[PDB]
Design a protein around this nucleic acid. Structure first.
Length: 221
RNA sequence: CCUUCGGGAACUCAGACACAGGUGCUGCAUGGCUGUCGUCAGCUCGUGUCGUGAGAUGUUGGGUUAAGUCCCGUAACGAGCGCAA
């Protein structure tokens, strides 16, 4: 949870190169070294918990938390997270429309749904192009199968990259927990998490602590 | 020509009121299931987003194709309509 070692050993402290940096993220910076900014991990800790506390006090009252993270780096660690442990997620291309235009995205969760007979039957040419394009809908909307409407919290692990995601969340009102690296901007994210969002090591750190947040918050209730 | 043995009818033509006839005008208050695309997959829409707005995005880009069959990327996601069948 709050152990310097793992955080210090697994990414986190490292920020983006000084040239690419936001002046809004000045407070969460403990200076610089070797022409790179060092995120302050003495202020990450405190906030982390408020991010974990919130998340664990959301599943205790039974709620949904979207796990956004459609990035090469986080494109495998966001499959073995809290979404596999009982949450909704997105790992490939946050389609600009989900949550704000959820009604039109609601009616496109059926790719194989209305063909659960001949999809296991393996026609031939008329099925192969749908078989091929069954994964299409299985990749983009694949992790949003179960949702029952909108969520109540969003958890992005790279606010600068998944900036569209947060614009919709804020537009509707659903709180956003998010890792903000030095080059990103901490504006719009309800609960911030100032930390590295590029190294895999750090990527699992939040995911695994958020996986366990709902894991030690769903059994309680 | 049917017959309660009363009565009735159609027509070559035929007499009085009204008429049918537009057989001139005019596709500029009236065509519906075309008299001009080379066969362009090109023209649009619902919702969402961006803009004070008219708009725009979707439909742009990278590749590919007779060809929105496409594929990969992308504030868009779907759709109306195909050679296939």
């Amino acid at each position: 949870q709050v152990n310097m070692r793992d955080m210090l050993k697994a990414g986190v402290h490292f920020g983006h190169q000084t040239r690419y940096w936001n002046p809004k993220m000045g407070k969460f910076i403990f200076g610089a070294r070797n022409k790179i900014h060092i995120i302050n991990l003495e202020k990450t800790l405190p906030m982390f918990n408020e991010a974990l506390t919130f998340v664990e006090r959301l599943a205790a009252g039974k709620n949904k938390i979207l796990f956004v993270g459609t990035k090469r780096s986080a494109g495998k660690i966001v499959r073995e997270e809290a979404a596999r442990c009982g949450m909704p997620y997105v790992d490939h291309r946050w389609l600009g429309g989900m949550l704000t235009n959820y009604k039109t995205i609601r009616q496109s969760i059926k790719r194989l749904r209305d063909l659960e007979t001949q999809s296991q039957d393996g026609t031939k040419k008329e099925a192969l192009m749908r078989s091929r394009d069954l994964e299409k809908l299985e990749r983009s909307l694949g992790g949003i199968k179960d949702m029952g409407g909108l969520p109540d919290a969003l958890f992005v692990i790279d606010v600068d990259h998944e900036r569209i995601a947060i614009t919709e969340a804020n537009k509707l009102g659903i709180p956003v927990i998010g890792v903000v690296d030095t080059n990103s901007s901490p504006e719009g994210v309800d609960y911030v998490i100032p930390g590295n969002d590029d190294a895999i090591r750090a990527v699992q750190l939040y995911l695994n602590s958020m996986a366990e947040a709902v894991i030690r918050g769903k059994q309680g209730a």
